[PDB]
Design a protein around this ligand. Structure first.
Ligand code: BBJ
Ligand code: ZN
Length: 258
């Protein structure tokens, strides 16, 4: 009986195995745009993905992860609210059963159809496992998805999902360029938070982009054909794999823009 997004093992149950679920810097949160304060001391975000080396795509039973070679500074996030260099390790999405839900973060209570998370770890801690034990161990770049025009840079991901339908399935996924998933603007909100999945560790600097990307209905429909279950088990569609907004508590959300 391990954690998931069902009625019996979903977000409301996670605290029983992971008491930090009720902690002081949990994610996601609602971003109240009028309460977020412009911070002129925040630098522009530096996203350097030109030498990114994707390796594999994996259905892990909760989402699909596109994994990168993080043994050298190849794809890094710097600047913004961050001190030092954060290396890209993987990206994944959260999405809904319907277009009106799916994102984890919300904006004035608005839910987007999905949310892309690019996960980076602080290279002063040597490896990801050590980084997640630190309050500034990770930086996650969050990008909202709305349904409209297709995202050309997403299609290579969409096309391979048939080969990783069920939990535990992986496929080679080389030469994917994550720059094709970014919006025009890198204006962002930032706050200190946590992993949004167990173990819910409070190790993340969240950087959530203001501008959503647009994906087609057909693209998100293919996300919804994935399975939570393993091969040869009863089919449970991988949908609504998002944690709802958590209490902001003693935190301020800062904006990079006016
Ligand atoms: N929505 S979220 O907070 O970004 N979810 C994070 C998903 N997991 C990962 N993302 O990028 N690498 C991940 C990954 N290992 O590298 N899983 C993972 C998750 C928690 C842990 F404590 C350890 Br150790 C590993
Ligand atoms: Zn995530």
């Amino acid at each position: 009986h391990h954690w998931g997004y069902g009625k019996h093992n979903g977000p409301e149950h996670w605290h029983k195995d992971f008491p930090i679920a009720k902690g002081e810097r949990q994610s996601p949160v609602d971003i109240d745009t009028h309460t977020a304060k412009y911070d002129p001391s925040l630098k522009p975000l530096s996203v350097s993905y030109d030498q990114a080396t994707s390796l594999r795509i994996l259905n892990n039973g909760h989402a699909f992860n596109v994994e990168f070679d993080d043994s050298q500074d190849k794809a890094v996030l710097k600047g913004g609210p961050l001190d030092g260099t954060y290396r890209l390790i993987q990206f994944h999405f959260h999405w809904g059963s319907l277009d009106g839900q799916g994102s984890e973060h919300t904006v004035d209570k608005k839910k987007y159809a999905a949310e892309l998370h690019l996960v980076h770890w602080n290279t002063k801690y040597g490896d990801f496992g050590k980084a997640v034990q630190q309050p500034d161990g990770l930086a996650v770049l969050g990008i909202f998805l709305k349904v409209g025009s297709a995202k050309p840079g997403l299609q290579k991901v969409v096309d391979v999902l048939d080969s990783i339908k069920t939990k535990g399935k992986s496929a080679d996924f080389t030469n994917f360029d994550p720059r094709g998933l970014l919006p025009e603007s890198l204006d962002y909100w930032t706050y200190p938070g946590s992993l949004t999945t167990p173990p819910l560790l409070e190790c993340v600097t969240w950087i959530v982009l203001k501008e959503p990307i647009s994906v087609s209905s057909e693209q998100v429909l293919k996300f919804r054909k994935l399975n939570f279950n393993g091969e040869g088990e009863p089919e449970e569609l991988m949908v609504d794999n998002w944690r709802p907004a958590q209490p902001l508590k003693n935190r301020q959300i800062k904006a990079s823009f006016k």
